């Protein structure tokens, strides 16, 4: 066992597709049970929680605190402070994070299928590459013309950091295998990347025959 505090930025999915974009501060490693002082600072809906989750993923549970409403304060970029007070030891625990600065947008690219696949004329592969964006965090989705294809139907790698002797940037690729017909048929496909640094938070690159 061993208690540690932790702060988590609001998920991009939520930041770009949810209403109640809430933030989470969480204390783990407690042997105790509760009675923990979860006091932040930006009082604009402040309403922690606990519901003691034995799911400390370890032989000794813990609890957490939420700050609903803070969907906008986050985009502005204020330094949130979640001070945690628990039994065991005195001097409480305090971790605090804010928005990330020094950001760049994704340079999306929708690559056509490999000549060789058009030959085997079976299933052509559409590759999507987003690169050069900062906040590692990014979303990627697909469309057949105007209809978003289910995630269950494509593969998206993990946003990794690229090689550069300076501006720290990340890159993400994704593969969508489509029916040979449909590609030659004519209907288009699109790659839709989401991001904080984008203007409308989403770019959409489209390619066809």
């Amino acid at each position: 066992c061993h208690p540690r505090l932790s702060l988590h930025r609001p998920a991009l999915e939520d930041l770009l597709l949810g209403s109640e974009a809430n933030l989470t501060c969480t204390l783990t490693g407690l042997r105790d049970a509760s009675g923990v002082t979860f006091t932040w600072t930006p009082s604009s809906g402040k309403s922690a929680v606990q519901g003691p989750p034995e799911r400390d993923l370890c032989g000794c549970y813990s609890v957490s605190s939420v700050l609903p409403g803070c969907a906008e304060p986050w985009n502005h970029g204020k330094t949130f402070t979640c001070t945690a007070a628990y039994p065991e030891s005195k001097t409480p625990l305090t971790a605090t994070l804010s928005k990330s600065g020094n950001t760049f947008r994704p340079e999306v690219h929708l690559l056509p299928p490999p000549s060789e696949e058009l030959a085997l004329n079976e299933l052509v592969t559409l590759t999507c590459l987003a690169r050069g964006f900062s906040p590692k965090d990014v979303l990627v989705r697909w469309l057949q013309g105007s209809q978003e294809l289910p995630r269950e139907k494509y593969l998206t790698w993990a946003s990794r950091q690229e090689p550069s002797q300076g501006t720290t940037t990340f890159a993400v690729t994704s593969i969508l295998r489509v029916a040979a017909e449909d590609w030659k048929k004519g209907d288009t496909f699109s790659c839709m990347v989401g991001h904080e640094a984008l203007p409308l938070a989403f770019t959409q690159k489209t390619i066809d025959r």
Binding site: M192, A201, T203, T206
Partner: protein
Amino acid sequence: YDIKDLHRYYSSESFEFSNISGKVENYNGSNVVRFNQEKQNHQLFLLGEDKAKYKQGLQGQDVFVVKELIDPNGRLSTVGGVTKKNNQSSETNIHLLVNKLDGGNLDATNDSFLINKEEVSLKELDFKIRKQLVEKYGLYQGTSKYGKITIILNGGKKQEIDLGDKLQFERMGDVLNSKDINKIEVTLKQI
């Protein structure tokens, strides 16, 4: 800005809603008004003059939507295009001269352009003119891409839209008013 994407875009259907109202949320850090109209929800981004001009959301204005894209949540995002209410106090047909320049020759084609309201959105003004430049002058098609829409106001001053790439969102908020427009000239420099 590669031909196919410009033809694509400057071809899409544009809507002209009326008497719209909204609050404004800080989506991803930018002020945007949301509103449903024809069974389709929109998400108007205020990024230019309109950002301050409409710092209190929308309460009765008209809106020119043009699909930048549709959020994976089903919300068509459009940029600017907001013009005051009680604005249909006139029509207006302005002179539109189009000049397709090729082997170094000319090919002027004095045409005409219509303005739906009194106060205009550089967005609408630009969007339509290109739509009309494609449908009748094969723009962003084959190889006609570069150009330069020029709007000429009474007095003398004139505004310019480069055809090279979509109008900057920064200026979709901009508003002109019919009456101060003498003529419009284009130059489909098909290089």
